[PDB]
Every structure is written in C-alpha cells, then in structure tokens.
Amino acid sequence: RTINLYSSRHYNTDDALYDAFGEVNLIEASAEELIERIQSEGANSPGDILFTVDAGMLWRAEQAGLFQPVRSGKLNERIPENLRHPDGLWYGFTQRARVLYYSRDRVNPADLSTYEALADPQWRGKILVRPSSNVYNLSLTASRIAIHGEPETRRWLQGLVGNFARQPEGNDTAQIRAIAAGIGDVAIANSYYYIRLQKSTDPADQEVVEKVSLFFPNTGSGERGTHVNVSGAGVLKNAPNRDAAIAFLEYLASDDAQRYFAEGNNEYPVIPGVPIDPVLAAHGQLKGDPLNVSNLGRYQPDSARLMNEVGWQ
Ligand SMILES: [Cl-]
Ligand SMILES: [Fe+3]
C-alpha cells in the first residue's frame, strides 16, 4: 500500500499519520507550486493524492481537471455533504477556524467583534497578520468579497493595512508570539495553532498562552459566523497507485486518522464518532460561516488582486 503524496500541509506530527498508513512518498510544497507541477508533468505525473490546507486551492485544482472521482460507501457515510464535491472529486477531512488572538493585557475583548471592525482607526499600529500570498488570508479575503462585495472589502483592507504593527512576516504562530512580545495587540490566525501552545510543556509557549487569548470573530448579534476553512484531498487523475490512493482518502476518514487530526493537530474532525479535543472545546462551540466553500476558490484571483492593490505585502 504505497502512494506519492503531494502535500501543502505543514505539520511535523503529520509524519506519524503517514507512517500509520504505509509507504508514503512526500512531495511537499505550496499548493500553487504543487498544482503547477502536476500540470507541467502532464499524463506522466506520479502523483496519487493532492492534500491541501485550503478549500480554495482544492477548488482550483478541481477546476483545472486534476482530480478523478472516487465514490465509496465509507467516504459517502463519513464526510458531511457540504464539506466535499458532489461528484466526489475531493473531500474535506478537517475543519479549521480563522480566529482572532489578542493581548489579555492590552485588549478588552468587549472591543472585539468582527474581522471587519479591525479597520477601525482605533487599531493604528496594532494588527499582526502573516503575508498576503498565504492561502489562509487569500481565502478569508475571498469570503469577504463573496459576502460584502469588492468596494467594502477594499475599504476593510485599506483600513487593516494602515493598522499593521509591522510589515507581515512569519506564520500564524509568529503573529501569536508577537502579541506576547508586545509588537502588536491583535492577530488574525487559525484556531488549532493556539491549542498546540496550550498543550505544550515548553515554558516559553505557556508564556505566550498566559499573555494571549483566543476570540471567535463574527459570532455576535447579526454576524454571519467565523470564517471556517478545510484541509482536504482527492485522487489525482493520473494516479499510478489508484487503489492505494483511494485507500488513503478512506484512511483519512477513519476513526484513527480523525482522532489524530482532533487530538494531535487540534483541528476539528469532520466525521461523526470522534469528539473535539477538550482544550479546543473549552473555548466554545464553533459557530462557522455558512458560505459554500466553493466561493473561497471562486474569489481567489480577486482576493490576490485586491490585497496587492491596497498594499498588503
Ligand atoms: Cl493549501
Ligand atoms: Fe496550518
């Protein structure tokens, strides 16, 4: 049982997941780089699976004609109707929330509400987010354009960029740490990164958790919900290990794999039969935005374009 896996995932604890399945050859790069590669390789690509951390990039790979369909009883039963492709071209295996983090010392959480409100001039020199090319931010801005239209997203972005603590650098975790070091006050980053810190024995990670808290945005009165994205995969069209590939997707939907995603990388499992991690549950029930995740991919070029325009570097 052996695959060639094209992964844009970036979690060292993922290795244990791959080993538990079988012989797994990793081809790891950014989703964009992986898509261009599968394309340039043509009918000769040895790739079996494309595993991303973004429904947007899944949507684009799917639009490009990269996935072959995979119907099976197990998948059909274990993956929610909305977190997958109707024809089964790809499946979402985890869910994750793009949340807000804030300084417990400098921020009153009664001041927080939405991503939108962060363009208020009251956050001059106070916001931390990672670079615009990142897929998480792409998706977020794309969902905003879907929901509010371009002019309003442009406005939000103009405002938000003006409120940057520094030129964006570092990953989601780096923005959480920067809050602790007092470089900024509020950060946009994914939920599961914070839970990792809460479980860490590292005294420096407890120092970040002691200083920084998680706030769910857009969950209040009249608000749509938290931006939720998904990590997912589908079988590539020229898979030389077609059988092993399907075995992998079903393996990702298995109690074991979902239990790993839940309590090893602190994401939200998608299958019934596995609980959300207690440390993640302690924060509250996830109130995610209903938006069809196809929008995330549909508005990606506009998102890239817009963030370029306002100067989000
Ligand atoms: Cl990705
Ligand atoms: Fe991540």
Curated annotation (Swiss-Prot):
Q: How is it modified after translation?
A: Predicted to be exported by the Tat system. The position of the signal peptide cleavage has not been experimentally proven.
UniProt topology in membrane: Peripheral membrane protein
Question: Which InterPro entries has this protein been placed in?
Answer: Ferric-bd, SBP, TAT_signal
Q: Which GO terms describe its cellular component?
A: outer membrane-bounded periplasmic space; plasma membrane-derived thylakoid membrane
Task: Cite a single GO BP annotation.
Answer: iron ion transport
Query: What is the induction note for this entry?
Result: Transcript levels increase when cells are grown in the absence of iron. Periplasmic levels increase when cells are grown in high NaCl or in the absence of iron.
Keywords attached to this Swiss-Prot or TrEMBL record, sorted alphabetically, are:
Ion transport, Iron, Iron transport, Membrane, Metal-binding, Periplasm, Signal, Thylakoid, Transport
Give compartment(s). Answer: Cellular thylakoid membrane; Periplasm
- Example GO molecular function term? metal ion binding
For Fe cation, which residues are the binding ones?
Answer: 10-11, 136, 192-193
A Pfam family this chain is assigned to: SBP_bac_8
Consequence of gene disruption: Cells grow normally in the absence of iron; double knockouts of this gene and futA1 (slr1295) grow very poorly in the absence of iron and have a marked reduction in their ability to take up Fe(3+).
Give the top-rank taxon of the lineage listed in the UniProt record for this protein. Answer: Bacteria
* Membership in a protein family: Belongs to the bacterial solute-binding protein 1 family.
Tell me, in a sentence or two, what this protein's role is. Answer: Probably part of a periplasmic ABC transporter complex futA1A2BC (TC 3.A.1.10.2) involved in Fe(3+) ion import (ferric iron). This protein and futA1 (slr1295) are subunit proteins that have redundant or overlapping substrate-binding functions. The differing subcellular locations of futA1 (predominantly thylakoid lumen) and futA2 (predominantly periplasmic) suggest they may fulfill different roles.
Protein name (Swiss-Prot/TrEMBL): Iron uptake protein A2
This chain's source organism reads: Synechocystis sp. (strain ATCC 27184 / PCC 6803 / Kazusa)
